[PDB]
Amino acid sequence: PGDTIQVRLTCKRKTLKKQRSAEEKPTGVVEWAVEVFNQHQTPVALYSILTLVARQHGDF
Amino acid sequence: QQLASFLSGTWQSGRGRSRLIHHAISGEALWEVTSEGLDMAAARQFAIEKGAPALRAMTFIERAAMLKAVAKHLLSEKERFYALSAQTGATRADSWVDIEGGIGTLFTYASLGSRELPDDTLWPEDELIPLSKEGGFAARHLLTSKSGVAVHINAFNFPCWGMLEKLAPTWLGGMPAIIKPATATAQLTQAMVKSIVDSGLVPEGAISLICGSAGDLLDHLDSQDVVTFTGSAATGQMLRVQPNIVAKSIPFTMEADSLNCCVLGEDVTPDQPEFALFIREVVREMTTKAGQKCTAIRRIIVPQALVNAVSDALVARLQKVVVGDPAQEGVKMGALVNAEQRADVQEKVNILLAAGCEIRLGGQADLSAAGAFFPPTLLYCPQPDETPAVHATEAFGPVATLMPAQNQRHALQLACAGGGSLAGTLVTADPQIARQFIADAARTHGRIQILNEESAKESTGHGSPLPQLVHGGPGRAGGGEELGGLRAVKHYMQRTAVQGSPTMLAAISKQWVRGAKVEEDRIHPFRKYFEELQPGDSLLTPRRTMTEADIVNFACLSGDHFYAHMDKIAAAESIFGERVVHGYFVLSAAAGLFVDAGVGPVIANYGLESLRFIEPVKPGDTIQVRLTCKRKTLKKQRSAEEKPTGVVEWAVEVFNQHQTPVALYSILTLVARQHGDF
Amino acid sequence: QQLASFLSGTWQSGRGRSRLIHHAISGEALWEVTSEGLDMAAARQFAIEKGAPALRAMTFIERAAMLKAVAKHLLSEKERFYALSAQTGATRADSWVDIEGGIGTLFTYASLGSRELPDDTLWPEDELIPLSKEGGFAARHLLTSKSGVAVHINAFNFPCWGMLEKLAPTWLGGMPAIIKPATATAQLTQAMVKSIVDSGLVPEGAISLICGSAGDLLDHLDSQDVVTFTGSAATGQMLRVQPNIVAKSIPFTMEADSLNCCVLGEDVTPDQPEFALFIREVVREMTTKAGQKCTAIRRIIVPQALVNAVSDALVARLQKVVVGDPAQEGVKMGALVNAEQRADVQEKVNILLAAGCEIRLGGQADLSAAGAFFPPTLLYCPQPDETPAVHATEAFGPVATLMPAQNQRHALQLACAGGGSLAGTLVTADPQIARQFIADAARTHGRIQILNEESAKESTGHGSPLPQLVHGGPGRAGGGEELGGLRAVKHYMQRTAVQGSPTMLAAISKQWVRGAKVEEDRIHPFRKYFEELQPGDSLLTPRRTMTEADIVNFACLSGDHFYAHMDKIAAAESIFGERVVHGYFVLSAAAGLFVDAGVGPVIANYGLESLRFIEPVKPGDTIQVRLTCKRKTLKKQRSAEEKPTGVVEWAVEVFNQHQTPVALYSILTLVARQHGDF
Ligand SMILES: NC(=O)C1=CN([C@@H]2O[C@H](COP(=O)(O)OP(=O)(O)OC[C@H]3O[C@@H](n4cnc5c(N)ncnc54)[C@H](OP(=O)(O)O)[C@@H]3O)[C@@H](O)[C@H]2O)C=CC1
Ligand SMILES: NC(=O)C1=CN([C@@H]2O[C@H](COP(=O)(O)OP(=O)(O)OC[C@H]3O[C@@H](n4cnc5c(N)ncnc54)[C@H](OP(=O)(O)O)[C@@H]3O)[C@@H](O)[C@H]2O)C=CC1
């Protein structure tokens, strides 16, 4: 308690998908690298989330 | 055939030298007007000692309901007014403006008096002006209604509208009126006054009428009287130098003739839709009421590279204008009201022709026809800045000159060279042209309409003076302002800056001020009905300690994660010093403290008047809320089924353990009434 | 010794017939004034085409900072003004009012122009007036400053105050002034004007000065000029009928002298402190500035059974007042200004003695004394209603009549029988007596001070015209109002009702209206600094679905357990139909949506302008907030260490899934600036 929390969201890996049908939305599994820290700037709870970010232009 | 003047409660008439009213479309005289021998002092005496205390005893809400009742009584029998207005030579579309705008002025002042005026005789227009550091000497401005008569002198344009745009602020501001219509078309004004008097709605003496010359009315006015004029400038300057109006220093308000510009911008090209709506607006404005309205376009300012296009569009649009009798089909323009007005128009046309030019049928007008007709006239002036007769002489009919400009800087000078105008129009699509035009040409105009494609779909027009916009320009246009919303009822009131202790100003204004004595009476003010609330009925709520968990729960619940509330580092660097409680959480916990959870007379909140957060509320800092009533201001129960209610305004004052005021504001509340009226 | 005239930027002087300024307390002539040969048309020409575009190009915030700078520069060298003001016969405590009231009026108008005026050349005073059902045509009232001069004709009472109470509303309302002071005490006025000019704070041509007769100025005035008069009634009624003022229809604001009442109530008995403060107020008012202030008490109305007590108390208090030289000790009242004023006061006292009575040393005044001395005079009138000379003839000195009344209904008629008064006073303790007094005697008075024990502690008095209260009464007092707060700068501005589309009014007024076009630019408006915000920078927030759990958590957190939100049975019988979301929770979740959680230029909120909950929000009802900028209005950074900032107002427009607006309001916000001015 009484200990601030500041989060450093940063992108890590893009790796698009291939749009297995013609109807489905084009997208890609962008992985972010979340890095929480406090007022002493030491890293508490550094982890990594996956995220299905949609694409602007499909291919198939 | 006499025209009976309504003086001292009785439809009297004159005995002596008389004028007469010609039928404008045919030529015969079917009325004759006189007011000689009428006791003019007895009219003012009866008005002041009969109708002025009967109006000044009413509240403003009752005087707004009276205007709504007169409007509903006069809207029903509106068809006996078109028969009298067809005698003026006006069409059905012009008399529709003349009647329905005059009655919509009544409905508009009713809806303004029933929303922004108190249930009282004295109207405090300010909030409060504190004049002391300790808080025992404040002052506020009271508006008390004057105790005299309002002599209105109208003209021949709008007998219905031009009376009722002066009679609704007069009655709403608590004065009896003595309307003097012009003797050219006073019969429509007598029809209006007879329809008002034969209804039992207004008190006796609260309206008078002098069909004919006044003669000895301006020589009898007390200092608590006002005079409003509308007509020519030459007569109104003779009435301003009248040796009683300057002796008693009574307010003389004058509206005169003008030279209304209509400027076309450089951004408008003939392929744009702006050009067609420009030509349509100029033609409809010049032909509505046969050009006999005070806000008619009489100077069309166009750029030099568009003069031929504007002229060839205006002539091709104006040759379709049919001048004739209004009752027969296919006729758009009506006629002028008199042959004397026809001669007075054409003698100004000849003055404009002494230095200008000609595009259409100008001075060619038959001065021998049985009917006061005048053709639509579009003049021309090739040297606009070298001809001072264009910017000084107006032809009060369908006449409107056209003159070129030079790239939006000569256009501003030609729009401002009118000596003060009454209305104007810039037709552009570029808004930075309109910024310059308002910045440099609203000094001389009174109501400017910047017209474009979005405006022209639902525009009321250039010659439609709205009942909630200021009608009146400076200089040549008189100077006096009318119809300004509630700015019109303040010409009929005296603004008295009343000083004293706040507990005295609470009893004078029948409100609560800031530090008045309070009436705490052991029960809850939200439990009282409307008829047993008094302004001063207070409430001292229990306390609530603003803890650190309160900030966190409110920032979670709302989502307001602002750095002065949820961050400890950044709030140490901010102006407060540490984390503070949310202002909206103080606003919400206040209503948590004073609102009764039960079912009571309080129906809905729906409002919050003026919130200011003075000092920050910190963690570990208690909050105590002082709910006290300020205004009552009931509603008039517009149907028979609806619940009787009134907008009670509470004055909420939060404070802390140091008793300094944090977050003082004011909420509106629709408290139900115990007993209805309608 | 010549006394110059600051015309056309040069300290000119006249060549011809000259009046001369006598020393008041001794009797010699130490200045002499003339203005013959001075080109007045060239003076107005220089003030219009040199000083008016230099004032009208400034914003209102800069024109208030100019008034604050002139106030500080004139407060610094204030000791060279008391030496000039002691030549007028005033004391130190009577010249303290004259100097510091004018300089405090300058500071007051600086504070009003900094707090309630925009960073703009134009000034939109309304919110908005919608004139259409769809929303494509609206109108709002603008206030553009006039493009002429203000001819202020002052008097001999207040050279410092009486100029500076007309000069700060003139300069704050964007006009150059041409002050014509009285030729009895023009030396203090030229000291003020020279201290203003020799500082570089005001532009050139923004002030002029004619120490002497104008003669040719009023004949050369354009229609954009305003004229303000303060003096006798008989002169100002000759200047109102001046043919150019009525021909060009220029505003003529007149302040004349009146018979100010001071009514004592029936509830006051001589054992109460009300009697003591009544006698103290009457004596201090009548002896301050030798009774020469325009708001001095000149009719003491007492009850019939208290004539002897009031008379004995006024005799026992007034005989301690010493008339003599102000510099020597033990002298309270100073002297008059001229021997002509002594002759005028004595010949008005003789007219009052043609039908009155006598209680003290009255008309005995040595007309050959070296100095304009006059003893304090208390008259009497045993028949107050049967004597029309008391209610019509003022004595402009230490003279005031005394007259009885009959039980607080004859006192109202005697207070109203003055024919309009500049100020008044009721001294009571019962507040219903004050209610009955303001309800009938505020029609004739311009400023009423209800005086009691709680007010008399920190009262400014009866003869201190406040810089934020209306100074001016009807009828005999002139009719023209002054100093009404921001009502004084509106006499120098033309009120123009600018119509058009709201996206046009947003660029005309440099604000946002209701339906203007927006500039959504992919980042957050709370991240922008001050100088990169524009009015129209919108924000379309994400949605938030209001649910039943939201109502439950907010009614739990605040404590607002009102039956339309918590109870299910009574919500089915109320006006809504079912349980609704709290209005304050819509207000709070809005700020949950649009507020940036980060550290940005937004410092504090402290404001909520005008909230109205239009339609109710139910469970299962999304909410989408439209945060858009409306005003910028920067502050002036009163120190060099303080952070530069400016009050930005955001217009918040919440709506729901049907896009109908629930809960539209406006919040103030203190956004920090990028570049300061110090
Ligand atoms: N609002 C505007 O801009 C208007 C402009 N005009 C201008 O007016 C000119 C002609 O209209 P006009 O008929 O001359 O209007 P007037 O100048 O004749 O005066 C109009 C009104 O004032 C009344 N009136 C005239 N003299 C006195 C007086 N001494 N004391 C009291 N009331 C008086 C008239 O009564 P009576 O009718 O008995 O004289 C009428 O009611 C037109 O050419 C046009 O320029 C016309 C109408 C209004
Ligand atoms: N505020 C008030 O209520 C005041 C009341 N008074 C009343 O005034 C009476 C006399 O004082 P007085 O000094 O004679 O007031 P004035 O009648 O002299 O008028 C005062 C001002 O008007 C100026 N003035 C006079 N004639 C003209 C003119 N024709 N054109 C332009 N300006 C002009 C005077 O300048 P000049 O000095 O050159 O005439 C002075 O600046 C007193 O008895 C008192 O009753 C006195 C002062 C103010």
Curated annotation (Swiss-Prot), chains B, C:
Gene Ontology biological-process annotations: phenylacetate catabolic process
Effect of a null allele: Disruption causes the conversion of phenylacetate (PA) into 2-hydroxyphenylacetate (2-HPA).
Annotated TM spans: none
Chain ranges of the MaoC-like domain: 536-647
Protein name: Bifunctional protein PaaZ
Region of interest: Aldehyde dehydrogenase: 1-332
Entry annotated with the keyword Hydrolase: yes
Source organism: Escherichia coli (strain K12)
